[PDB]
Amino acid sequence: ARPTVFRWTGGGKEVYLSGSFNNWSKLPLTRSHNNFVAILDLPEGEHQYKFFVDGQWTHDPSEPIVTSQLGTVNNIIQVKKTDFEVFDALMVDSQKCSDPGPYHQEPYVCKPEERAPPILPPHLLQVILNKDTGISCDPALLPEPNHVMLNHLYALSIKDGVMVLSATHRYKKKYVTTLLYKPI
Amino acid sequence: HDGRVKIGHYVLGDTLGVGTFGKVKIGEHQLTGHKVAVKILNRQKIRSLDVVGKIKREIQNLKLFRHPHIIKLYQVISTPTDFFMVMEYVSGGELFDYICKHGRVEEMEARRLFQQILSAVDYCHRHMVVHRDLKPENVLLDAHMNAKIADFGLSNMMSDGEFLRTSCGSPNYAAPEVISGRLYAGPEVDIWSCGVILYALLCGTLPFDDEHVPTLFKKIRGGVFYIPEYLNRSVATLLMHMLQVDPLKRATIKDIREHEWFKQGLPSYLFPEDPSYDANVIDDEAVESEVMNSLYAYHLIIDNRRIMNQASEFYLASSPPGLKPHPERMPPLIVKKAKWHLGIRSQSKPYDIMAEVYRAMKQLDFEWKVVNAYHLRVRRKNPVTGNYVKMSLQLYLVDNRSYLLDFKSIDDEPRLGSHTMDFFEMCASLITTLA
Amino acid sequence: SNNSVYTSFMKSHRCYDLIPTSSKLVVFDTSLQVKKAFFALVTNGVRAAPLWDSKKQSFVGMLTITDFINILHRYYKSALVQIYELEEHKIETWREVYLQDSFKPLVCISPNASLFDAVSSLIRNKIHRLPVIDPESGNTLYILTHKRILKFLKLFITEFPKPEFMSKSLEELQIGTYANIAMVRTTTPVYVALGIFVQHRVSALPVVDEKGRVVDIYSKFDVINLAAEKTYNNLDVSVTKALQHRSHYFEGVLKCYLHETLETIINRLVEAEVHRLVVVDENDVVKGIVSLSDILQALVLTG
Ligand SMILES: CC(=O)N[C@H]1CC=C(c2ccc(-c3nc4nc(Oc5ccc(C)c(C(=O)O)c5)[nH]c4cc3Cl)cc2)CC1
Ligand SMILES: CN[C@@H]1C[C@H]2O[C@@](C)([C@@H]1OC)n1c3c(c4ccccc41)[C@H]1CN[C@H](O)[C@H]1c1c-3n2c2ccccc12
Ligand SMILES: Nc1ncnc2c1ncn2[C@@H]1O[C@H](COP(=O)(O)O)[C@@H](O)[C@H]1O
Ligand SMILES: Nc1ncnc2c1ncn2[C@@H]1O[C@H](COP(=O)(O)O)[C@@H](O)[C@H]1O
């Protein structure tokens, strides 16, 4: 099965679908609320189609058009193998968008708007090492950390030329709060 | 022949509603008459908004999800113009309509519905997902009055060390920092919305409502709401904790699970670490071929996990509110104390700080990427290990006259050396240069 | 019947299963002054700390309270003179004089490695601490000890059938040392007690009064209080004066009997969270010492 959707977004009280697959014969479209649709099993490749709205020949301007030698303007949709598998279809939609660069030692120029740094989240001020764990527990133990403070640096005020740094890192389902006493 | 609109053997009917992204239509089977809910997503509309990645992640999560209080996604049918998401259908409709019809939901049924909602919310949070649009309109009911959450969208993933600033949801259900447009962690934002749902269930009105939008957000920021006389003292305290203005002081799912009002008549299969949960819920952990209802080793892992989970005080520390101490506790240094701070703090202008950062990095031969004027992706090649050390710098506002430079490690690709040591040494070099 | 059930358990469980959900690790740079490092162990409440050599970009060893005992006994001269070496030496300078004619590489374990391998490593190398290092990231995750292994095994004793040895007495099984027991008198100077821990490499010395009764115990852990109270410069004081700080919240020396079953010894060691018990007969005369080293060597490696 290869379903192809033919949706008429425009107005009208009577709408027919006529295309190369139906040998240019008028197929009736059922209406919901200003929406005339039909889902058809169609093979791969380009298909030329047109709409017959209230006894008049018209096209959907939001879709691609191929004008014939006699001036016949009609829509065209190319069925693609990627269009039937969702992950493959999404893969195409990402590449079609076409919307940062390499590692450089050049400083960024001041913003033209000139506005303010973001307000510090309160979750980051919840220092794990500034908390008491209770006398009964093994002193090596600590409480379960919030995921938002993981990978973040925390430091002690430099005393006698020695710098003390700390960060909470996660290995699998477990967490480690490594501390480092390194003289400057 | 009739022009019946058919998709994957299902005949499409009336529109059930319009969500955050797409249109939802009822589908009845051509041969049996089995009812499904089909969310139709226009491919070009997705391209027009550039939310392909969001739709890709939304599908991924709903495929993995397996919870009785979350709308099940059966299949996704891809067509050249649209995406058809075949889902579980529920005849009861919106919880919002149920609250309106009855005017007020009775304490017994209100608790039962809230327990189911919180169970579905807890499942999302354990799977690093935050709905960010919890409201009775997005909470559906089955024939047997069971609440099933839906309309995943306006939702995002939760990663380590990262926060979410996107403002998502209706103003009446949005938390104070979302209203303020501030950075936040995922779970406390969903809990605020659940607090409004619990208030709406028990009262039949909203705790923060006003015609004038700026007054409404002033009401949310103030956290002042009416607690009616018919509400019992126990449920009043739960609402007060869930709707706490301060996110750090705000109730967690663990706090709600422990609350005496919530505990009443709570089924033993809704939450993990519960007598009936291990017996009624299949663990995601698979150790590739599937073997079920046949003898043989999955339960051995479940048993071993239960022993370790039961053994608290062995894997986690117990924060204090007589008690024997531990023989390896060490005495205080001799009357001496110290306090840890998140990062270097400066009172100077924001661009004066940033200019000093670029000068310090260039002297240290660092290679950086300008993601934002106050957000950089810094790199440095270690000479001994022969590997690259990646980290993220971010300037924040502590107070009006106070700022902070945040240091965060990038976990990507050190067997020869040490990843944590590489980050600390890269940080120490930058802090010393800035003096 | 199978007596190798605990051996099979240790072979089946990884080192990862013992690592706590959330714990802290203290790391020292080899260029850091030892006095600062010993004070840092007190303020962070940790006994041991892995050593990081920034020049070689690798973990070189471990700094335990044994290093403090070895520094004090080797360099202490008088309560009248400052110990210059403890006051001015760096970790790297001390490691050079200690490993002189007795160099030692880093003894470690992987979180994916079995516990059988970790227990074997502790016994073979005659160590108490064993750093768990991830080979992928190169990060030291946890400091594995005998106390942690036995407490983990204690949680699973009801999961497998108990072997015949558990129901057998300590006298029949012959677990622990019962000859040449290293002890200290109530009036023994701290410097003397430090000299015995070096010469014998034992972790604790029972304190015996002149009459013949064991009033207190002097462990390697109790020595770190000299850094905490900054009383390390006066080692002429008696072990009783050194243990005066813990007079409150102390029941006494935790003992065990030869007639008592191995299962009850393990339960008492796990509940008390201590490394050893003093063995006495029915007559209450000291028979010897039974440490977790003796327990794990008998339950894991011998079958
Ligand atoms: C007897 C009868 O009434 N039969 C049927 C008539 C037609 C029906 C019908 C079935 C499906 C669609 C349909 N509707 C679609 N809407 C699509 O894109 C969207 C999605 C969401 C929104 C909000 C919009 C929009 O902007 O209008 C467009 N793609 C669509 C694809 C299809 Cl096939 C439209 C109408 C239902 C009953
Ligand atoms: C604002 N609320 C609406 C209510 C309505 O439509 C929405 C847009 C919202 O629901 C979240 N819609 C519903 C569902 C859906 C899923 C994703 C996104 C939006 C969704 C489903 C899923 N299965 C349900 O049966 C069905 C259900 C739906 N709606 C209904 C109205 C009556 C009966 C069933 C429905
Ligand atoms: N004070 C002591 N005197 C003699 N042997 C001891 C003493 N303490 C421990 N032992 C033994 O020394 C070995 C290791 O001791 P430990 O450092 O306690 O693990 C074990 O075989 C113990 O039985
Ligand atoms: N058998 C015991 N009786 C009483 N206290 C003990 C005993 N063994 C160790 N301790 C104490 O336990 C603490 C930790 O020492 P350790 O057991 O070597 O880790 C020290 O303060 C010791 O004095």
Summarize the structure.
It is classed as signaling protein. The complex is a heterotrimer of chains A (184), B (435) and C (303). In chain A, 7% of the residues lie in helices and 34% in strands.
Can you lay out the helices and strands and say which pair or pack?
The complex is a heterotrimer of chains A (184), B (435) and C (303).
Chain A lengths: L2 E3 L9 E5 L7 E2 L1 E2 L4 E2 L1 E3 L3 E9 L2 E3 L6 E3 L5 E7 L6 H12 L55 E3 L6 E10 L2 E10 L1
Chain B lengths: L5 E2 L2 E9 L4 E7 L5 E8 H7 L2 H13 L8 E6 L3 E7 L4 E2 H8 L4 H20 L2 E2 L8 E3 L5 E3 L6 E2 L18 H5 L6 H17 L9 H10 L10 H10 L10 H6 L1 H4 L13 H4 L17 H13 L33 E3 L3 H14 L3 E6 L2 E7 L6 E10 L5 E7 L9 H16 L1
Antiparallel strand pairs in B: 1-2, 2-3, 3-4, 4-6, 5-6, 7-9, 8-11, 9-10, 12-16, 13-14, 14-15, 15-16
Helix pairs in contact in B: 4-6
Chain C lengths: L4 H8 L9 E8 L4 H10 L5 E5 L4 E6 L1 H11 L8 H5 L2 H8 L16 H10 L4 E5 L6 E6 H10 L14 H4 L10 E2 L4 H11 L3 E5 L5 E6 L5 H4 L10 H4 L12 E3 L4 H11 L3 E5 L5 E6 H10 L2
Parallel strand pairs in C: 1-2, 6-7, 9-10
Antiparallel strand pairs in C: 2-3, 4-5, 7-8, 10-11
Bound molecules: the ligand CC(=O)N[C@H]1CC=C(c2ccc(-c3nc4nc(Oc5ccc(C)c(C(=O)O)c5)[nH]c4cc3Cl)cc2)CC1, the ligand CN[C@@H]1C[C@H]2O[C@@](C)([C@@H]1OC)n1c3c(c4ccccc41)[C@H]1CN[C@H](O)[C@H]1c1c-3n2c2ccccc12 and adenosine monophosphate (2 copies).
Count of discrete alpha- or pi-helical segments spanning 4 or more residues of chain C: 13
Give the biggest sheet of chain C. Answer: 3 strands, mixed
Biggest sheet strand order of chain C reads 1-2-3
Q: List the chains of the largest interface with their residue counts.
A: A-B, 89 and 100 residues
Q: What does the largest sheet of chain B look like?
A: 6 strands, antiparallel
Q: What does the overall shape of chain B look like?
A: globular
Specify the structural class of chain B: alpha+beta
Our Rg estimate of chain C from Cα atoms comes to: 20 Å
Shape of chain C: globular
The molecules bound to the chains, other than polymers, are: ligand ZQV, the ligand CN[C@@H]1C[C@H]2O[C@@](C)([C@@H]1OC)n1c3c(c4ccccc41)[C@H]1CN[C@H](O)[C@H]1c1c-3n2c2ccccc12, adenosine monophosphate
Query: How much helicity do the residues of chain B have?
Result: 25-40%
Arrangement of strands in the largest sheet of chain B: 1-2-3-4-6-5
What string gives the helices and strands of chain B in order? EEEEHHEEEHHEEEEHHHHHHHHEHEEEEH
How many domains of chain C?
Answer: 1
How far is the N terminus from the C terminus of chain B? Answer: 82 Å
CATH evolutionary superfamily of one domain in chain B: Transferase(Phosphotransferase) domain 1
Number of strands of chain C: 11
